[PDB]
Design a protein around this ligand. Structure first.
Ligand code: HEM
Ligand SMILES: CC1(C)O[C@]2(C)CC[C@H]1CC2
Length: 397
């Protein structure tokens, strides 16, 4: 028997802790013998689990196209995924338009604003002694910031999350497509308003941009809106949720981050290795051999970053969260020409979220009377993290 044969990133066996990590560890073990295996899920596809094999695939853009970046394809109607779903030279020209606002200096401008935001969110339940850390904090910190980056109302996160749910999970394809069309209607309204009232936000920037002398089409602009909203609120929320869950029970990790706040950036990087939500696909466009396996045009390869992030030939003691680990060249943010546009931004969001939360609520635990829930898929992580804690005091009021 092989664990590859029924591997499916939307249906990962969960262990007694509520995560897929026992299964990932078992697949990692098998991958030492077979780093690429055939799964019969989704009609048949390749699962790439070894670290060096994922590196080989993700560097080989001639044979492995980002037209397959989501598999099964995300529900975005007739729209492509902007940047993420493109190959060069097209990909590079679109990404250049938004490189500046995602640079470390540009995103660092939001640091203290994120800190204030995080504290305002914590104020809403600190006097109560209980909350779902995912819905209360993890969902809201990145959704509010993303809203501000796109010039959306930050208070409407439930609307934005409903759109993303349709893109990533709704099973009835008519329904999912209709809800995605709601996002598209709102994007058109936003774009029309920005045209007349341009600001310093990222949508105004791409609206005023040109490629090869031509303004972007309304469709390309909707594409930018979609990928930035999607990227900004989904994997960030799942990652932060998984982190709050881990900190709720892992009292040893928690006390160390309180004692050594200077280690929080490196610990965020290690938590990205361990809880990185993402996997990505590639469409095979030319016959290619990777290790023992020859892939053929039209096949899809899924890059199982969480398994490669646990590869013993790439990391010492990969099953331990070693907060001082360097260089820690994990693949949770990708590698090569598509490497995550939001990399620096999530590092800042996570550092601030963890720092302020542990400052405000150093003592907390999982609620024994409510269930946690792990969401599976191409972006995976805790969805519900009910916690309890001693009642504390609001900063504002
Ligand atoms: C925990 C948080 C996140 C994780 C794990 C993550 C993961 C990734 C990964 C693995 C890729 C590579 C795609 C590939 O190789 O096909 C990627 C690309 C990308 N991400 Fe992120 N992402 C995160 C947050 C963000 C945020 C905050 C944004 C923007 C607000 C964002 C926007 C993008 C975009 C636009 C791409 C495509 C870049 C390109 O194609 O050149 N992501 N992300
Ligand atoms: C699912 C995932 C990882 O997130 C986005 C923003 C980047 C790569 C893919 C598709 C879209």
């Amino acid at each position: 028997t092989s664990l590859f044969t029924t591997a499916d990133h939307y249906h990962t066996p969960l262990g007694p802790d509520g995560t897929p990590h026992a299964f990932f560890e078992a697949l990692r073990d098998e991958a030492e013998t077979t780093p690429i295996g055939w799964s019969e899920a989704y009609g048949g596809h390749w699962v790439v689990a070894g670290y060096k094999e994922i590196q080989a695939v993700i560097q080989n853009t001639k044979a492995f196209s980002n037209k397959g970046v989501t598999f099964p394809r995300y529900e975005t109607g007739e729209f492509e995924l902007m940047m993420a779903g493109q190959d060069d030279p097209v990909h590079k020209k679109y990404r250049q338009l938004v490189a500046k606002p995602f640079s470390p200096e540009a995103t660092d401008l939001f640091t203290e604003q994120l800190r204030q935001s995080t504290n305002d969110l914590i104020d809403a339940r600190i006097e109560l002694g209980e909350g779902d850390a995912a819905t209360w904090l993890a969902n809201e910190i990145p959704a509010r910031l993303t809203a501000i980056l796109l010039g959306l109302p930050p208070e409407d996160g439930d609307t934005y999350r409903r759109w993303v749910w349709a893109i990533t999970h709704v099973e009835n394809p008519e329904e999912g497509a209709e809800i995605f069309a709601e996002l598209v209607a709102h994007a058109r309204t936003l774009i029309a308003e920005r045209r007349t009232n341009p600001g310093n936000d990222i949508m105004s920037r791409v609206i005023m941009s040109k490629i090869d002398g031509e303004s972007l089409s309304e469709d390309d602009l909707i594409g930018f809106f979609t990928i930035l909203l999607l990227g900004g609120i989904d994997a960030t929320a799942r990652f932060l949720s998984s982190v709050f869950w881990r900190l709720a029970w892992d009292i040893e990790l928690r006390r160390r981050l309180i004692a050594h706040p200077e280690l929080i950036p490196n610990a965020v990087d290690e938590l990205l290795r361990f809880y990185g939500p993402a996997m990505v696909g590639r469409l095979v466009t030319q016959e290619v051999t990777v290790g023992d396996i020859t892939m053929k045009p039209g096949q899809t390869a899924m890059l199982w970053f969480p398994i490669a992030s646990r590869d013993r030939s790439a990391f010492d003691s990969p099953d331990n969260i070693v907060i001082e680990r360097t260089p820690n060249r994990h693949l949770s943010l990708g590698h090569g020409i598509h490497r995550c546009l939001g990399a620096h931004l999530i590092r800042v969001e996570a550092r601030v979220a963890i720092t302020e939360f542990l400052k405000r609520i150093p003592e907390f635990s999982l609620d024994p009377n409510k269930e946690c829930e792990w969401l599976m898929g191409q972006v995976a992580g805790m969805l519900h993290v009910p916690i309890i804690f001693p009642k504390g005091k609001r900063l504002s009021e």
